[PDB]
């Protein structure tokens, strides 16, 4: 979730740039940490994939779709050395899990507050 | 409301027009905007809808101020006028209206006690998957608005079932449901009420209203008490010959129980005989396959062909069984002297007349028309049934009618036995009726249980003693209709007490019948069977010495089908098992009343089934006896005359064993067809079913004495020595 | 209730007036919009009714941000204050009142057992 | 329910991973719903009937540790309540004979009926 928030902030910063542009990997620094987040997302997706009782239902969830629309395009960008804004905003859907974290850190106790935060 | 809205709209539009076209006075009228009146009307409508295109708007200070005030005032006015808009919308009547008739689409109307359980049972019995293609639409008529669950039940069957709110007693509501073109009207009774007489009177009033609106309509009604149906004879338009029928729940149920007392498993056979069951194929060597080979049979009526005229009943029955593979049970003898009467397996002295109706048991209705298109000249040589074509080439001992055993009336003090007195006498081969009665409980009409067991078709020494175990306060309210029967005794007590059961020698009785009377008090429908199930489990767990109560034959009345599996000690193989496939039902040890709700359906598609069941089960009650009971509200004795003694000769339901009888040499591996033919030819005996030990197909020995029912086995069906045969035995003197 | 509504309306209008006339600080106050206080009052009333002509609107970044926050807060406040509005409307007595006599028009009064059949 | 939760869910109780599932056919009122919401992390409620096998399948009675049956201590006829509880025991044992059952009985002479159940 923290890396998702970081990716959302990076997208917010990058939105000012043109939609299509070319930028060197070695010269740029933000794209490096963007790929650092993206490879962690890919590893997490693979770990959920191997620990799946049914592959179809796991393959038709919103998190998997966000991963599909986030990680293959950044691999294409690093391969072709050209950047496109794309659907990087979909990472914001991770905010739907936010309330659960507020239950993990004992912040929320009442169910009404939990469902309001949700 | 519309006038107020339009006037406010026009006035506001004109005022905006004035302030916009005039301009601000302090600006020397230099900020005026060229804006027509209709453009201001358009602006006001765009504003009040909260759309606000912004193509036209007020530019002056006064115009903007007045627009702000108009927005505030319009919001306040709309908020104030919402309740009147709601009142104009109103509460829509969900089930008001009338039924729309469809050409070529018959409909029936169901009224009376319209609740969740009754409607669910009626739809389960009527709308069945195995039912053939029938174009009948069910229309329910009731004045009480349904609850959510029953509305969902209607929505499940919205393509075939409709509901309309109304009253039968109101002729307008009868006109709404198109009762003048309905096929039939079915009236359901409230089986759980404090006063059955009031419910019967209400049903009779509904019948009277329906017949007053349309005298030619067919009516099938439910009656709670047996003595009330005579009121239906007071209606001049009630024609029993035209299909109007009354189904007495207590009479039919207690007759089924009594006939099962005479021969266990008969209630299961009858219930499976007129009920539509889905076909299930089982190949494993279990008792379910042998049971399902007999479940498939159904009951039909057919007119005998002219080739059978002049032949005796046994000859025609043998020809039907051997050639046409049909079991012909009964005929309808028509004599203008005595109207028409259903004769159950008449003797060889009677001959088939012209155009006589006959009752058959067959797997399918297509194979019933054989008895109508049978000619000896062109079909005798044919062996395969399917190859046959339609080619044509001093002391009173009996009652007044002499059909029931009768005795002098006696006080209840002469039949009450104490526990010590009951233990002193020895009772063997008797019937023990445990009753969960109460002083304030509704009467169940115990006479309908005693009359079949006290029929004149039995000898005096063959009569089974009846011992009623229950509260004496309830039994005193029923003794006025039971004091004319020879052998009836009362033990005041509780059926749940083991001392009372041991006093009446429950281990030696021929049958124990558990009945409940406190069904209306319990609000929850599934808890209405607690006392009966507890009594059954208590009796099955008793111990005896000279050895256990598991072998005691017990018949338990149950309201809910899902409780029937509670009578089997073995764990449920599947909690979703259907009622007819459960072990207690297949063995005849449980009687679910819901089968009666099926009988009405079997009555709708064939009116002779109810008459045949009444003349087979109730002991042979006649309309003359009905009229006498209506006149006197009791049974009147009479001296014996040759006419009444000739009226004594009938046929009775019995079970016979093949261990040591005349057919013992055939029960060891012989076929059922030879047994049937020999019984029909020699003793004029009609075999129509096998009561077979459950653990008989198993090679290993077993101690289980439970038996299941096989209805009308084929000719090549094998026989084992440990079998019982259902039969209709003639009276012998 | 009316005092709360009017005070909130006036305060929001004045705050919008300040942020619009002052201009954005990071733009060196060059995007200021000449907008009188009463025009801001008009804008707030048009916004709160969900009409939105668009003849007047906030052009600065701060103005648009504060308009978004005011829309959210106003929707939340209205949703919270609906039950008190319902209580003010109340349950109208349908059959309360008095009979209005008409000259030359006799009337009789029926009382006792007043049911449907009677 | 309040007494049962006070006795069962106690602070001094050692770490126990048992979740309580209530099964009743009567819809709860506001106070009892609030009582459930107070313990939503450990207590669940489902509307259904013990006598209906489908409702028993809903609450996964085939994998439950035990079934606890409470009696109506304030009733006109204790015998009817005892018979209803015995019927509930019979239904539960018919669905799953191997489950452990702890029941409440009002009258002492009625518990002998529990010896009539083979399971
Ligand atoms: C750990 C959890 C997870 C989430 C999170 O914390 C919690 O992670 C944190 C961390 O991950 C943060 C990020 C770390 C990396 C950061 C990088 C930073 O960009 C840098 O900004 C610098 C500003 O001086 C330089 O940019 C140059 O600035 C010059 C003027 O000074 C320009 O000239 C030149 O152009 C720019 O150069 C920029 O970069 C290139 C130079 O190499 C190109 O020239 C490019 O064009 C240009 O734009 C530099 O060069 C550029 O890199 C960006 O502004 C914010 C940034 C992304 C951060 C945003 C917030 C975070 C996500 C934090 C976030 C909360
Ligand atoms: C979750 C919180 C809240 C949102 C936020 O923090 C995290 O997100 C941060 C990030 O997104 C920031 C933006 C990143 C991109 C920046 C770009 C920068 O350059 C200007 O960008 C314009 C387009 O936006 C012009 O085009 C032109 O490229 C240039 O003039 C601009 O000057 C400020 C800028 C827009 C930033 C303004 C402040 C933010 C929005 C920050 C803001 C507090
Ligand atoms: C930004 C937008 C604005 C518009 C809107 O969305 C957001 O605002 C929302 C919000 O404002 C909603 C309203 C909030 C207040 C609601 C109140 C609610 O009534 C409640 O109904 C309960 C029913 O039990 C209570 O009833 C009590 O019940 C007791 C018995 O239990 C009795 O006593 C007596 O009856 C009552 O006491 C009591 O009657 C009341 O608590 C009503 O049924 C719907 C209601 C009016 C809602 C309708 C829809 C809305 C207007 C929504 C609307 C779309
Ligand atoms: C156009 C966009 C349409 C989006 C429809 C979203 C519906 C998703 C939905 O109902 O979620 C549900 C089903 O979840 C699914 O069944 C996910 C299906 C994702 C389809 C993506 C299609 C992309 C092209 C819930 O999904 P989850 O498994 O609870 O996460
Ligand atoms: C941004 C993304 C969306 C986030 C939306 C979160 C919106 C915050 C308010 C939600 C309701 C909080 C509340 O009622 O107070 C709760 C505490 O307070 C918190 O837990 C504060 C969480 C702040 C984040 C009450 O907690 P309790 O368990 O009753 O004690
Ligand atoms: C039905 C009777 C209603 C109406 C009958 C018709 C009245 C208007 C037509 C004649 C005036 C007209 O067109 O002249 C000019 C004004 O044009 C407008 O005002 C156009 C906008 C009309 C708004 C809708 C009319 C009233 C709405 C419904 C009111 C219902 C009460 C032409 O404008 P131009 O050429 O664009 O310059
Ligand atoms: C009643 C007291 C309310 C108000 C009394 C009047 C106050 C405003 C009039 C003086 C200011 C004025 O016109 O100057 C300029 C500003 O013009 C505007 O601001 C016009 C828009 C007025 C919006 C409605 C006023 C407040 C709404 C209701 C507020 C209720 C609280 C002229 O603008 P121009 O010539 O278009 O350039
Ligand atoms: C452009 C639109 C201009 C709108 C007018 C602007 C401005 C005029 C504002 C006064 C209107 C008349 C009030 C009286 C009235 O109609 O009472 C009604 C309620 O309605 C109210 O009480 C509305 C209160 C405002 C009667 O209430 P009821 O529903 O019988 O209860
Ligand atoms: C332009 C409009 C700006 C709008 C303000 C924007 C922003 C300010 C947001 C906070 C407003 C104050 C909250 C407290 C409050 O008034 O409680 C009330 C509820 O109202 C709420 O709880 C509103 C929640 C938002 C009191 O609740 P009640 O009805 O007594 O129950
Ligand atoms: C209930 C109503 C009738 C009473 C309220 C008075 C209203 C209708 C009066 C008071 C002030 C008036 C305005 C005063 C000044 C001007 C400028 C002039 O060119 C005529 C129109 C116009 C714009 C007037 C229109 C009518 C007006 C708004
Ligand atoms: C509860 C309230 C009082 C506290 C919140 C602080 C508010 C009122 C403060 C914080 C930041 C402030 C703004 C910061 C910058 C400018 C530009 C300058 O030309 C003055 C106005 C304006 C636009 C200020 C208006 C007031 C402001 C929005
Ligand atoms: K709107
Ligand atoms: K709008
Ligand atoms: K708009
Ligand atoms: K607009
Ligand atoms: K059948």
UniProtKB/Swiss-Prot annotation, chain A:
<feature type="transmembrane region" description="Helical; Name=Segment S4">
    <location>
        <begin position="81"/>
        <end position="101"/>
    </location>
</feature>
<feature type="transmembrane region" description="Helical; Name=Segment S2">
    <location>
        <begin position="31"/>
        <end position="51"/>
    </location>
</feature>
<feature type="transmembrane region" description="Helical; Name=Segment S3">
    <location>
        <begin position="56"/>
        <end position="76"/>
    </location>
</feature>
<feature type="topological domain" description="Extracellular">
    <location>
        <begin position="77"/>
        <end position="80"/>
    </location>
</feature>
<comment type="function">
    <text>Potassium channel activated by both membrane depolarization or increase in cytosolic Ca(2+) that mediates export of K(+). It is also activated by the concentration of cytosolic Mg(2+). Its activation dampens the excitatory events that elevate the cytosolic Ca(2+) concentration and/or depolarize the cell membrane. It therefore contributes to repolarization of the membrane potential.</text>
</comment>
<feature type="topological domain" description="Extracellular">
    <location>
        <begin position="16"/>
        <end position="30"/>
    </location>
</feature>
<feature type="topological domain" description="Cytoplasmic">
    <location>
        <begin position="102"/>
        <end position="116"/>
    </location>
</feature>
<comment type="similarity">
    <text>Belongs to the potassium channel family. Calcium-activated (TC 1.A.1.3) subfamily. KCa1.1/KCNMA1 sub-subfamily.</text>
</comment>
<feature type="topological domain" description="Cytoplasmic">
    <location>
        <begin position="52"/>
        <end position="55"/>
    </location>
</feature>
<feature type="transmembrane region" description="Helical; Name=Segment S1">
    <location>
        <begin position="1"/>
        <end position="15"/>
    </location>
</feature>
<comment type="subunit">
    <text>Homotetramer; which constitutes the calcium-activated potassium channel. Interacts with RAB11B. Interacts with beta subunits KCNMB1, KCNMB2, KCNMB3 and KCNMB4. Interacts with gamma subunits LRRC26, LRRC38, LRRC52 and LRRC55. Beta and gamma subunits are accessory, and modulate its activity.</text>
</comment>
<protein>
    <recommendedName>
        <fullName>Calcium-activated potassium channel subunit alpha-1</fullName>
    </recommendedName>
</protein>
């Amino acid at each position: 979730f923290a890396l998702s928030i970081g990716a959302l902030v990076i997208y917010f910063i990058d939105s000012s740039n043109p939609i299509e542009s070319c930028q060197n990997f070695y010269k740029d620094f933000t794209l490096q940490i963007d790929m650092a987040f993206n490879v962690f997302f890919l590893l997490y997706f693979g770990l959920r994939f191997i620990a799946a009782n049914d592959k179809l239902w796991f393959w038709l969830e919103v998190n998997s779709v966000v991963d599909f629309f986030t990680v293959p395009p950044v691999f294409v960008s690093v391969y072709l050395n050209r950047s496109w804004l794309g659907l990087r905003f979909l990472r914001a859907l991770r905010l739907i899990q936010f309330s659960e974290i507020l239950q993990f850190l004992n912040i929320l106790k009442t169910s009404n507050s939990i469902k309001l935060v949700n | 409301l519309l006038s107020i809205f339009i006037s406010t709209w026009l006035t506001a539009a004109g005022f905006i027009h004035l302030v916009e076209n005039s301009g601000d006075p302090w600006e020397n009228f230099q900020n005026n905007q060229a804006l027509t009146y209709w453009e201001c009307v358009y602006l006001l409508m765009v504003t009040m809808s909260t759309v606000g295109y912004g193509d036209v708007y007020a530019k002056t200070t006064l115009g903007r101020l007045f627009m702000v005030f108009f927005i505030l005032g319009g919001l306040a006015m709309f908020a104030s006028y919402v309740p009147e808009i709601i009142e104009l919308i109103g509460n829509r009547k969900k089930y008001g209206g009338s039924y729309s008739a469809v050409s070529g689409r018959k409909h029936i109307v169901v009224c009376g006690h319209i609740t969740l359980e009754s409607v669910s049972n009626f739809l389960k019995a009527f709308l069945h998957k195995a039912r053939d293609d029938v174009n009948v639409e069910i229309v329910f008529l009731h004045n009480i608005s349904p609850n959510l669950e029953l509305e969902a039940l209607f929505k499940r069957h919205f393509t075939q079932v409709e509901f309309y709110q109304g009253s039968v007693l109101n002729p307008h509501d009868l006109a709404r449901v198109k009762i003048e073109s309905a096929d039939a009207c079915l009236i359901l009774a409230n089986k759980y009420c404090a006063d059955p007489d009031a419910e019967d009177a209400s049903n009779i009033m509904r019948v009277i209203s329906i017949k007053n609106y349309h005298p030619k309509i067919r009516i099938i009604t439910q009656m709670l008490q047996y003595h009330n149906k005579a009121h239906l004879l007071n209606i001049p338009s009630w024609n029993w010959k035209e299909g109007d029928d009354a189904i007495c729940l207590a009479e039919l149920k207690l007759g089924f129980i009594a006939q099962s007392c005479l021969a266990q498993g008969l209630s299961t056979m009858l219930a499976n005989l007129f009920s539509m069951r889905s076909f299930i194929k089982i190949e494993e060597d279990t008792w379910q396959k042998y049971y399902l080979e007999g479940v498939s049979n159904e009951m039909y009526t057919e007119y005998l062909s002219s080739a059978f005229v002049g032949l005796s009943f046994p000859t025609v029955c043998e020809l039907c069984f051997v050639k046409l593979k049909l079991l012909m049970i009964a005929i309808e003898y028509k004599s203008a002297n005595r109207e028409s009467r259903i004769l159950i397996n008449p003797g060889n002295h009677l001959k088939i007349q012209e155009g006589t109706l006959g009752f058959f048991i067959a797997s399918d209705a297509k194979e019933v028309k054989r008895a109508f298109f049978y000619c000896k000249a062109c079909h005798d040589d044919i062996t395969d049934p399917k190859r046959i074509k339609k080619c044509g080439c001093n002391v009173k001992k009996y009652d007044s009618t002499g059909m029931f055993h009768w005795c002098a009336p006696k006080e209840i003090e002469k039949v009450i036995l104490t526990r010590s007195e009951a233990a002193m006498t020895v009772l063997s081969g008797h019937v023990v009726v445990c009753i969960f009665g109460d002083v304030s409980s509704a009467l169940i009409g115990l006479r309908n249980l005693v009359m079949p067991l006290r029929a004149s078709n039995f000898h005096y020494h063959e009569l089974k003693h009846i011992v009623f175990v229950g509260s004496i306060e309830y039994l005193k309210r029923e003794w006025e209709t039971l004091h004319n029967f020879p052998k009836v005794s009362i033990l005041p007590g509780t059926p749940l007490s083991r001392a009372d059961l041991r006093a009446v020698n429950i281990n030696l009785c021929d049958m124990c019948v558990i009945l409940s009377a406190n069904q209306n008090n319990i609000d929850d429908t599934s808890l209405q069977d607690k006392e009966c199930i507890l009594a059954s489990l208590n009796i099955k767990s008793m111990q005896f010495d000279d050895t256990t109560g598991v072998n005691i034959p017990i018949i338990t009345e149950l309201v809910n089908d899902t409780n029937v599996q509670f009578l089997d000690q073995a764990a449920a193989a599947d909690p979703d098992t259907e009622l007819y496939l459960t072990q207690p039902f297949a063995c005849g040890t449980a009687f679910a009343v819901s089968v009666l709700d099926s009988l009405m359906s079997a009555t709708y598609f064939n009116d002779n089934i109810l008459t045949l069941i009444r003349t087979l089960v109730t002991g042979g009650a006649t309309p003359e006896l009905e009229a006498l009971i209506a006149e006197e509200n009791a049974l009147r004795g009479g001296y014996s005359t040759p006419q009444t003694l000739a009226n004594r000769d009938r046929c009775r339901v019995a079970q016979l064993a093949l261990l040591d009888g005349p057919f013992a040499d055939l029960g060891d591996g012989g076929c059922y067809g030879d047994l049937f033919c020999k019984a029909l030819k020699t003793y004029n005996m009609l075999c129509f079913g096998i009561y077979r030990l459950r653990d008989a197909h198993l090679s290993t020995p077993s101690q289980c004495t439970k038996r299941y029912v096989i209805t009308n086995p084929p000719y090549e069906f094998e026989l084992v020595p440990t079998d019982l045969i259902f039969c209709l035995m003639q009276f012998d003197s």
